[PDB]
């Protein structure tokens, strides 16, 4: 591909990353991040 900075938008090289997420029965290794909150004690709270 002849990419040159002068070219147009379509012409410009683009870095593309595709994250395929194979889903199998097997143990899941890649999980999402943890959105957590502060811990409060001595109060009736709904904890997870």
């Amino acid at each position: 591909y002849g990419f040159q900075p002068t070219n147009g938008v379509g012409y410009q090289p683009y870095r593309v990353v595709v994250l395929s997420f194979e889903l199998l029965h097997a143990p899941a290794t890649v999980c999402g991040p943890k959105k957590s909150t502060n811990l409060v004690k001595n109060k009736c709270v709904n904890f997870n």
Binding site: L24, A26, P27, T29
Partner: protein, 48 residues
């Protein structure tokens, strides 16, 4: 891991085995084999 003083057989006694590792390999394994090591002293020539 425990220390023992007994050559002949397993010692009679009860102990638990705590889990060290859980690996996600997910491969079907039918068989296994153990590996041993050789020990050579200074006196020995290196050859096999």
């Amino acid at each position: 891991h425990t220390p023992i003083n007994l050559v002949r057989d397993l010692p009679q006694g009860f102990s638990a085995l705590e889990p060290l590792v859980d690996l996600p390999i997910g491969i079907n394994i039918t068989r296994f084999q153990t590996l041993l090591a050789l020990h050579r002293s200074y006196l020995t020539p290196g050859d096999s």
